[PDB]
C-alpha cells in the first residue's frame, strides 16, 4: 500500500530545485520514499525578498 | 516548506462556515496554518436531521 | 440506486441561498432527496435588477 | 463580443462578499458587466490579522 | 469534520480488490473510516512478477 | 437524438456489478439504451454493513 | 430555477447542426429553454454511412 | 512574450463564425494577434431573437 | 481492441472540416476508423496566410 | 524514454479483464511494457448483444 | 483586489526561466505583482532556430 | 495534418532536460518535429539509483 503527502517545495533558483526541497523534506521524515508527482508549481513574488519558485508534489511512499 | 491536509468542515449555516469548521479543526492542532484552498463544496440531506453545507478544503500550513 | 439531477437555484443573497433553492425546487418535485454537490457558482449583473447568485447542484435522490 | 477579466476579491465575512467585491470592482471601471463565473475559493489565515475569504471570479463585460 | 488520506492500494487480482486493499490499511490504524474515492486505477507490469492492478482512493474517516 | 441520465449504481461486490445495477435500473423503465460511461466510483463504509461499492455512470439512450 | 438536460445532437453536416438538433429535440417537448452548453463534440464513422459529427450539450430550460 | 484576452465572440450562423468574431474584435484594437484557443462554446437561446452560437476564445498575441 | 491516434486536421474553412481534415488522414493509412473525439480547437493567425482553424481529434480505429 | 498507447479493451466480465484485454494487446507487439493507466471506462450496450465493458488505457512501453 | 493577467514567456534555457521572462515583463509594467500560477508549458521547435521553451503563467497583482 | 506521440524522458538533473531527452528521442526517429507540450512531471526515487526527474510531453510532427 503506498500513501501520498502533499507537499510544496521552495526554492530561489528553479522549480526542479523546489521539487527536490519538496522531497528531501518527506525523505526526512518518512521511510520508503518511492515518487513524486508534480501537481501545481508558481513564483511567489510578494511575500518574499528575492522570487521563490513553489512546486507542490504528492510524494509516495510505501507503508510497512 | 508547506504540507496540506485535506479536511471537510460542516456547518448547518453557510458554505463558508464549513470552510470555517474544517479551518478551526487544523488550527487545534496544527501550527503555522496558511491557507486553505476550498476543493468542493456539498449539502447532506439525508443522513442528517437539519440540511449540513459541507466544504471541503487543502488547509495549508508551514512546516519546522 | 441514485440518480442526479442538474439543478440551477438562484438568489439575491448568497451562493448558500442559492443552493438551498435547487434543494427546495428538488425536494417539492422527489421524494428521498439524499444529497446535493455543487458544480458552479456564478453570479448574474445584466439580466437582472439586483445581482443574483446562482448556485448549480447535482441533486442525488434514491430511486424506488 | 464579451470579455473577461481574472479577479480575485476579498473580505473578512464570507465567500459571496469576496465574489461581490471583486464584482464591485469591476463595476467601478467598466461599462455593461453582465456576468461572472466562480472559479476559485480560498482562505487566507497567514497573511493577515482575521481570516480572510477570497473568491476568484471571471467577470464579463460587453464591449462596445 | 472529515480527514482524507490517500492511499495506494494493490491486487493481482482486481481494481475492486486492490481498492480493497487500499481501505482495510486504513480501517487497521484509523477510527472511523466511511467512505472512499477512486482517484486513479493503473496496473504495473514491469516492476512486478504478475500484473499488479493499483486503485488509488482519497478514505475519508471523521475525526474525534 | 440521445439522451443521458445519470444514475449511481451499487454493490457489495464490485464496481462492475455497481455498473450493471444502474444499467439495469436503466433497462427498466427506458428503451433504447445504448451505452454508459463511467463517472465516478466510491465505496459507502459509514452507512452500510458491508462494504458497498458505488459506480455513477452517465446511461445513454436513443430518442424516438 | 433552471434545469439541465444532457443531450446528444447528430448531423451528417457539422458541428453547429448538431448541436441545433440537440436544441430542436429539447424545444420540441419543454417550454422556456433558455441556453445550452457544449460538454462534448465526436464523429461516428463506422456505425453509420455518411460520417455523423455529434454535438452534447446541456440544455438549460427554466422550471415554472 | 505572448499575452492573452478571454473572449466570447457571438454569431447567428456558427460556431466558427463565433470565434471569428472574437478574434476580428482582438485583431481590431490588438497588434500581433497569433492565435486562438477555443476554450467554450454554447448557444443563447432565452434572451436573443434567433439562437446565437457562442464561442469563447484565448486570443494570444505578441507583446511588443 | 481499438487503439486511438491524436491528430491535428486543418482547414480555411471550418472547425468541421479540420476534423474532417484528420479524419480523412487516418482513413488513408488505417483501416476500420470507427469515431473520433474532439480534443482541442484552436486558430492560427500568425503563421499562416488565412486564418487556419484546427480541430485535434483522437481518431479510434478497430485493430485486428 | 518511455512511450505510451491509447488503447481500449473490451470484455464481457468485467472492467479489470477489459484492462487485461488492452495490455495483452500491447503486449503482444511491443516489447517492454512496464505500466498502463486506466483513463476511461464504459459499457457499450447497443451495438453488442451482452453487455461490454471497455476500459480505456494508456499502455507505457520501454523505448531501446 | 488581485487581478491576473496570462502571460506566455519564453527561454531557450529553461522552464524556470521562460517563467521568469514572462514575470519580467509583468513587473516592467505592472504595479505590485505578488505572485505568478503555472498554468501551461511547451516547447516551440519549427518555429525558432534553438528550441524554445515557453511556460504561461497567471500572473497575479494588487489593484489601487 | 499534425500527430501527437505521448513520450516521457527522463533526467538526472532537472525537468526541463528530461522534457528534451523526450523531444530528442522524437527528433531522432521523426521528421517535421513542430512543438511539444507538457502533460506531467514526476520524479523517480524509488526505482533508481538518483533521483530522475520525468517530464512527460505530447510531441507534435507534421506528417507529409
Ligand atoms: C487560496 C490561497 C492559495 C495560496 N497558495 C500559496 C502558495 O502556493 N504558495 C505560497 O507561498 N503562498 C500561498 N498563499 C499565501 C500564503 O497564505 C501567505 O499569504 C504567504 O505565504 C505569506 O504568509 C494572497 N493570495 C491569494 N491567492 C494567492 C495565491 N494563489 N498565491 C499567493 N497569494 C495568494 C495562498 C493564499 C491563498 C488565500
Ligand atoms: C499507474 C502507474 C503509473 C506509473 N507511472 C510512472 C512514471 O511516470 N514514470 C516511471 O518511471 N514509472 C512509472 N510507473 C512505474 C513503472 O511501471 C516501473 O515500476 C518502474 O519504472 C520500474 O520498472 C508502483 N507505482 C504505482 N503508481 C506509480 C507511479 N505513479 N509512479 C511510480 N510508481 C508507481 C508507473 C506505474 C504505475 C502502476
Ligand atoms: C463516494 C462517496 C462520497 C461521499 N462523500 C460524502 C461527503 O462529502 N459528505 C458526507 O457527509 N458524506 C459523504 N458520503 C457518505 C458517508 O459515507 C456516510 O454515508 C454518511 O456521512 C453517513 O455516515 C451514499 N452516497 C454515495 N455517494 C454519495 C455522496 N457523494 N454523498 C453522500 N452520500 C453518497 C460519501 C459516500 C460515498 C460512497
Ligand atoms: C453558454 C451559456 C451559459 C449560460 N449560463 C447561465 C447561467 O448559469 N445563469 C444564467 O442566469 N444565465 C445563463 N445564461 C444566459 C441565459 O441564457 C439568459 O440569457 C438569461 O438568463 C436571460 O434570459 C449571454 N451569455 C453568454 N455566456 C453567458 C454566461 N456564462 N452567463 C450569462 N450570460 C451568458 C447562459 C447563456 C449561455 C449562452
Ligand atoms: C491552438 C494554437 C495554440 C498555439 N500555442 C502556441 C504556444 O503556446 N506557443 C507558441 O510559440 N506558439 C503557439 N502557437 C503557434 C503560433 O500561432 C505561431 O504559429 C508561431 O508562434 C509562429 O508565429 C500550428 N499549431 C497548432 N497547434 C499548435 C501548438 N499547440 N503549438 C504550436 N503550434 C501549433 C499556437 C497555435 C495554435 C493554432
Ligand atoms: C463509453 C462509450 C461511449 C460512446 N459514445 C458514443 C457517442 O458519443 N456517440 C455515438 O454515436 N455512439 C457512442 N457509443 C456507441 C454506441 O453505444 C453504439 O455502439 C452506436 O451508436 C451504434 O448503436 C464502441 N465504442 C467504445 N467507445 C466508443 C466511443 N467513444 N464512441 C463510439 N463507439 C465507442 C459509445 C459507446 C461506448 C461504450
Ligand atoms: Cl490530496
Ligand atoms: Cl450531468
Ligand atoms: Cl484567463
Ligand atoms: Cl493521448
Ligand atoms: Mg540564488
Ligand atoms: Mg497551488
Ligand atoms: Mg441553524
Ligand atoms: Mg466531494
Ligand atoms: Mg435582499
Ligand atoms: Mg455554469
Ligand atoms: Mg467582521
Ligand atoms: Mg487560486
Ligand atoms: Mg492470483
Ligand atoms: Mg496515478
Ligand atoms: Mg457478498
Ligand atoms: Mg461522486
Ligand atoms: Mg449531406
Ligand atoms: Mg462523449
Ligand atoms: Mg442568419
Ligand atoms: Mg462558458
Ligand atoms: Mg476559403
Ligand atoms: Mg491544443
Ligand atoms: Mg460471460
Ligand atoms: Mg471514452
Ligand atoms: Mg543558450
Ligand atoms: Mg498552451
Ligand atoms: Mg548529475
Ligand atoms: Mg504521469
Ligand atoms: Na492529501
Ligand atoms: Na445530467
Ligand atoms: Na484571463
Ligand atoms: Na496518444
Known amino acids: 500500500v503506498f500513501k501520498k503527502v502533499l507537499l510544496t517545495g521552495?526554492?530561489?533558483?528553479?522549480?526542479?530545485?523546489?521539487?527536490?526541497?519538496?522531497?528531501?523534506?518527506?525523505?526526512?521524515?518518512?521511510?520508503?520514499?518511492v515518487w513524486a508527482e508534480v501537481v501545481d508549481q508558481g513564483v511567489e513574488i510578494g511575500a518574499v525578498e528575492e522570487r521563490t519558485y513553489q512546486t507542490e508534489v504528492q510524494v509516495a511512499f510505501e507503508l510497512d
Open 10 to 33: 521552495t526554492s530561489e533558483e528553479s522549480f526542479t530545485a523546489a521539487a527536490d526541497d519538496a522531497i528531501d523534506r518527506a525523505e526526512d521524515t518518512l521511510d520508503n520514499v
